[PDB]
Design a protein around this ligand. Sequence first.
Ligand code: HEC
Ligand code: HEC
Ligand code: HEC
Ligand code: HEC
Ligand code: HEC
Ligand code: HEC
Ligand code: HEC
Ligand code: HEC
Ligand code: HEC
Ligand code: HEC
Ligand code: HEC
Ligand code: HEC
Ligand code: HEC
Ligand code: HEC
Ligand code: SO3
Ligand code: SO3
Ligand code: SO3
Ligand code: CA
Ligand code: CA
Ligand code: CA
Ligand code: CA
Ligand code: NA
Ligand code: NA
Ligand code: NA
Lengths: 519, 519
Amino acid sequence: NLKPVDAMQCFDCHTQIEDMHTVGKHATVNCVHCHDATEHVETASSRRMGERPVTRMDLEACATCHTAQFNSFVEVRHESHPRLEKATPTSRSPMFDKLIAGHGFAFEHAEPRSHAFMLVDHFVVDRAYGGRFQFKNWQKVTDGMGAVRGAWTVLTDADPESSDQRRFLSQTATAANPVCLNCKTQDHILDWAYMGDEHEAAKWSRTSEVVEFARDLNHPLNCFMCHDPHSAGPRVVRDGLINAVVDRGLGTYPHDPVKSEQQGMTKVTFQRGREDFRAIGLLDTADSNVMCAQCHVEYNCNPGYQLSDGSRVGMDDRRANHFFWANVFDYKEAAQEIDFFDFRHATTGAALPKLQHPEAETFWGSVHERNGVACADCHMPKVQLENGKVYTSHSQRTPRDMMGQACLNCHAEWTEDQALYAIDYIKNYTHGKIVKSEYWLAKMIDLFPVAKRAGVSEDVLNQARELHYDAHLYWEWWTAENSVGFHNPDQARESLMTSISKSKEAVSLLNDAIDAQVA
Amino acid sequence: NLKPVDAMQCFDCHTQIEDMHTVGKHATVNCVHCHDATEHVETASSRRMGERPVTRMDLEACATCHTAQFNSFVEVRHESHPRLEKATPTSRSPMFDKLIAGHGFAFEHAEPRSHAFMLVDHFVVDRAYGGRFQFKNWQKVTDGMGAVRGAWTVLTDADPESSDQRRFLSQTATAANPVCLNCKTQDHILDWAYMGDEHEAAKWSRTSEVVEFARDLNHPLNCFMCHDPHSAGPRVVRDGLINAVVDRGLGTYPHDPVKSEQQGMTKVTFQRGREDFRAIGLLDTADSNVMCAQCHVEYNCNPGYQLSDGSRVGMDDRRANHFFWANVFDYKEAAQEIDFFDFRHATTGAALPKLQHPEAETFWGSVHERNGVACADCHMPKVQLENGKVYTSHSQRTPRDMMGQACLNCHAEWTEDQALYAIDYIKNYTHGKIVKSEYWLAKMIDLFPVAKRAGVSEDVLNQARELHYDAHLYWEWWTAENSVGFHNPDQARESLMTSISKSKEAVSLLNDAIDAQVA
Ligand code: HEC
Ligand code: HEC
Ligand code: HEC
Ligand code: HEC
Ligand code: HEC
Ligand code: HEC
Ligand code: HEC
Ligand code: HEC
Ligand code: HEC
Ligand code: HEC
Ligand code: HEC
Ligand code: HEC
Ligand code: HEC
Ligand code: HEC
Ligand SMILES: O=S([O-])[O-]
Ligand SMILES: O=S([O-])[O-]
Ligand SMILES: O=S([O-])[O-]
Ligand SMILES: [Ca+2]
Ligand SMILES: [Ca+2]
Ligand SMILES: [Ca+2]
Ligand SMILES: [Ca+2]
Ligand code: NA
Ligand code: NA
Ligand code: NA
């Protein structure tokens, strides 16, 4: 059984923790629930750690007193189809392979599934580690609780004796790097300096061997990613988000200074050897928009190239860990600002961006966001009980599974079927425009080889490449973004029409140039 | 196809109809929809009818333009169990046979079923016509639409060549009389003088041969019982109700003079040969409490006896058609006022009242009634449509079948299961007290023969008989009333505790007297 330690001993050296812990809703929660610090207390000085205390980062450290939230979190939504490739006619991006040719996502890009699996899915996807990591057997794919207990309880490593990224299966890639892990786990929260910069006190950084780092990580979406363990107050821990909101002064709601001030973030820094080491962002309110924006954003978490001169931008560069914190119509400016692109298209030769799940930046400015609605209202609603203590569901999933608690709790004028119908109207319309956008992108792409064989000039091809950047951006945002337009229907529509317009312009340019060579 | 007639010609004679028809919501509805008056118009003067016009009383006369209301009305609720005797351990009054001994209801008293069957059920019940009338075969019991089209389409008469009330089956009674029919049909509305008094212009009256009257009647619960055909406005047609509310000055809400004034009734009289003949009661508002009180009340519709001297009160007496319009705690006084009782108990010799379905007089004073709730809010709610024109459901049935439209439309704090639970709490509690009241009544009744054999004095027996009147009244109200307390739980409780108290008093009186004879 646990035996409490004297927190006053700790508070002598840990004044920020004292301030947070004594004032918040965990003032009665003893340190032993999460730290084994006996040898540390015997050996530390005011400025030197001595022996490192052991800190629990498993989610069961919180389940101890918060079983309802834990159990809701670890539920597996079996209706969220697993390992479902997006580059298929029945999924989100039927022409993805042609359009993304040159990028690692061509090797595999599945739809998301339940949060329990985030770390294991990151480890096993064909694009990440060359097939090095696999489930121990095909039964383990169902085991959400097991994945939560730890990735290495359900996975195997093809070669524990080597730590290099390489291909073990032929049609895999090795895109994973240390920055990725920040959106899969925070088991490394005490071992990673802010932004992944090099730091004497950091075991891991942007430039680490990712296979070695992987082996040290266990748990998905730790509870403390949104809740400070010392104050129990709302927070974020993700460096890239704090960097956008606070360091760059963009605010929590970059389009609304008033809401940014009311629902702000305060950066708190922790030191090692009296040098800044790590940071968190305490929130003014329990604002799920900002909590979920730790991960559900467009980002760089990867090497790339400069738009200006094509030079390589490696993991050592700060730009390899970057939150753009820009809506679709501000993204090109944001990427030009940091002088960055992701890949060159394998057929067209265009420098292109790679977009990922920009839910937060899409939600901005929507009617829902402007009315003060937040992600949790639809995806983590309060549970309605005839008799009981209310709590917040932590099963982050589609509102279709809890329409009474989600949509219908605000939209009294609708039946469930009516609300579903409104969702589907938007998704169906948006998906139609995604498909048309892909049709036109593909038409343009297929003209590049014809133009090259016809002897069309490099000047014309470069004009078309510039159009490809925009055609790509204004399409891929929406295959990347998970709501199929629901989060911001008007923006999806305007963007996708812009994509089609750009592709059409490029098609006309290339066809005319080919015709003139003939011729 | 129907051809309209010149209504203006009719109006030269029919000035009350003109006033009603031209102002109301049937101003455009031509008389030919309900009257064949060709020969009448050729022969009438303002002072002499000439040939009698034919008036349609079938409900299909209204279904023509109001199919939704018709079709909801004629629905058969199959879950309303048919021909279910109440004098059984699993129904409303387990000890009914012992308690009602001496009354014709001992021959059969079933639970009510859907309105479509009211007239056929009246005709075929074992207590009514000596078994003379039966369904044509046992399949016809399902045929609600057929019953609505006409009773004689689904029934047979054992002897069309005689018109006397007699027993055709051994264990039947001949309780039916012309007054009954007024709560089953209004096909006779132009053939029956107000109250069923003798009248030169009336084909039928209280003293008619009921078997002959029966044969002239076809349709249940005619639509015009609640809606004036000429104005389309809300009304009642039941003589006994108009007599209580208007003639006797009791008002529509005897316990609330203000509500009586706001939701009142105006008596309109029609003449034959320039003598008053029939009447209707136009309502100030579409008040279902008063509409349903045409039938769902305690009444006399039967011969009986005088409390004063025991003499017979026959059908010729006005008291044979009487609405008491009194709550349970005013009923004894009301019966004393008219000097009337129904039967003498076969065992105890007590003069007793016979109570019938006093839903209207029970509902008075309930929290619901005091808050302006009316029968229709629970039993004829408005339909809820995602897309459509709202109308009022005319399927009068338990709110359990439409909880969203009924209870939950007002009680937002409850789920369906919670609202059902609240109903069942009241009904279970009330039924328990009904059963206990019957236990104590039966215990008292069973002492009467013992006391007689022991030589107990007639004075003591008469004291006990006076107690029996009250013990009976304060019990039977609640087996008669169909809500098992729900309509007024506090009143049910007080009454049933009074019944038990009276029976216990009689039991003590009789036991002590028997013991004194012995020991
Ligand atoms: C002064 C003699 C200390 C005592 C008493 C306690 N700690 Fe400590 N701790 C101390 C230092 C100088 C450091 C390095 C960081 C800094 O603030 O300079 C630490 C570090 C920790 C950590 C972080 C460990 C990691 O992996 O990075 C934890 C979780 C921690 N300390 C916990 C802790 C507890 C629970 C104590 C009371 C039982 C406690 N510390 C006492 C110095 C001192
Ligand atoms: C029992 C010994 C606890 C452990 C282990 C954890 N928490 Fe806790 N938590 C506990 C209490 C007694 C309370 C106060 C309850 C109240 O409503 O007063 C809390 C509260 C929280 C909250 C709510 C915070 C708020 O400001 O409203 C959160 C978000 C929370 N706790 C989270 C949390 C996490 C993430 C834990 C593991 C790191 C954890 N708690 C452990 C008791 C206990
Ligand atoms: C936070 C800014 C992220 C970074 C950094 C990385 N990922 Fe991610 N990932 C993130 C979210 C919010 C989601 C769910 C929404 C979605 O669109 O899928 C994901 C999902 C995955 C998955 C599962 C789906 C799939 O593509 O097969 C995998 C396998 C995955 N992510 C891998 C991965 C890699 C290899 C990364 C570094 C190159 C990486 N992620 C970074 C959020 C974030
Ligand atoms: C990074 C640590 C994350 C945070 C914080 C949040 N989400 Fe997430 N989400 C993330 C990943 C990597 C994935 C894919 C996991 C996989 O193994 O494929 C997801 C997935 C979702 C989903 C889809 C669930 C499904 O049933 O398919 C939803 C609805 C979702 N995420 C919502 C969501 C919300 C509302 C968040 C704030 C409360 C949130 N996520 C945080 C990564 C991370
Ligand atoms: C008994 C006759 C079986 C039937 C019927 C099904 N499965 Fe099975 N399965 C069985 C055994 C003995 C094993 C090996 C167990 C072990 O750990 O040694 C399995 C294995 C699987 C697996 C894993 C396959 C792999 O890793 O290559 C899966 C995914 C699986 N079983 C699923 C499964 C399904 C869905 C079934 C119905 C279609 C099914 N099994 C039937 C024995 C038996
Ligand atoms: C961000 C993606 C979250 C993660 C990770 C966890 N929780 Fe959470 N939690 C989150 C939100 C948006 C809310 C509601 C805030 C509001 O005020 O509306 C909560 C709430 C809690 C609470 C408070 C009680 C309640 O409302 O249920 C507790 C005790 C809590 N969360 C615990 C908890 C645990 C144990 C987690 C890991 C299983 C966990 N949270 C993760 C957002 C996020
Ligand atoms: C209700 C007004 C919403 C708010 C606020 C947010 N989301 Fe949403 N989201 C919503 C819908 C109707 C859908 C489509 C779901 C469907 O079943 O059709 C989504 C989808 C997502 C997904 C993918 C879920 C899946 O396909 O299973 C994710 C990952 C997601 N939403 C995330 C998310 C974030 C992070 C939000 C705040 C920035 C957010 N959503 C808000 C409805 C609503
Ligand atoms: C005066 C010359 C009349 C004309 C024109 C119409 N009616 Fe008549 N009607 C008239 C009399 C004197 C009576 C007897 C009752 C009375 O008010 O004294 C009637 C009666 C009726 C009835 C009732 C028949 C019954 O069964 O009792 C009806 C339904 C009726 N009248 C209808 C009617 C119609 C529709 C007419 C125009 C087509 C019409 N009447 C003309 C005198 C006169
Ligand atoms: C068509 C030729 C009709 C026949 C036959 C009947 N009714 Fe009618 N009714 C008709 C119309 C055009 C209207 C007006 C609708 C409106 O909202 O304006 C009505 C109205 C009624 C009403 C509502 C009256 C009110 O609120 O004041 C009722 C209760 C009604 N009608 C009843 C009714 C009865 C019982 C009928 C058979 C005797 C009947 N209607 C026939 C058209 C027609
Ligand atoms: C209106 C004041 C009524 C008079 C006059 C008669 N009945 Fe009736 N009856 C009435 C109602 C409101 C109900 C339904 C509620 C209930 O408690 O049953 C009934 C029901 C019947 C039934 C069906 C149930 C049964 O007892 O088997 C029958 C067979 C019946 N009524 C017969 C009947 C007889 C023979 C009457 C005159 C002696 C009589 N009823 C008059 C309302 C009214
Ligand atoms: C006399 C013409 C009636 C009027 C006016 C109303 N009701 Fe009635 N009701 C009546 C009878 C004779 C019966 C029994 C019919 C049978 O054949 O047994 C009934 C029955 C009911 C019921 C029970 C229906 C079931 O499914 O069992 C209910 C709920 C009911 N009645 C309600 C009711 C309401 C609310 C009325 C005003 C709108 C109303 N009735 C009028 C006789 C008559
Ligand atoms: C064919 C092999 C039959 C089976 C199976 C059932 N029934 Fe029947 N039933 C059948 C016939 C030929 C008749 C006579 C039809 C006629 O009008 O001549 C009947 C009659 C009935 C009746 C009426 C009985 C009577 O009036 O005495 C009823 C109530 C009835 N049937 C119901 C019924 C039920 C509920 C059945 C399944 C339990 C059933 N029948 C089966 C032929 C056949
Ligand atoms: C009394 C027991 C009724 C009988 C018999 C019929 N109806 Fe009725 N009707 C009744 C009520 C309580 C109401 C609602 C009044 C309100 O304003 O709340 C109605 C309403 C109508 C209407 C109006 C349109 C609507 O609300 O649906 C019509 C056209 C109507 N009723 C027609 C109608 C028909 C055709 C009937 C015989 C099948 C019938 N009603 C009988 C009460 C009573
Ligand atoms: C809701 C607040 C009601 C009002 C107003 C009226 N009644 Fe009612 N009634 C109500 C309930 C909950 C019940 C019990 C039904 C059950 O399923 O348990 C009843 C019952 C009846 C019945 C018998 C119905 C049956 O057993 O199927 C009748 C005939 C009845 N009620 C008639 C009636 C009258 C005439 C009303 C106005 C005077 C009246 N009810 C109002 C709920 C409500
Ligand atoms: O209290 S923290 O800064 O060690
Ligand atoms: O690869 S992750 O960003 O979806
Ligand atoms: O007999 S009738 O009144 O129920
Ligand atoms: Ca999914
Ligand atoms: Ca990106
Ligand atoms: Ca019934
Ligand atoms: Ca009576
Ligand atoms: Na899905
Ligand atoms: Na708002
Ligand atoms: Na029933």
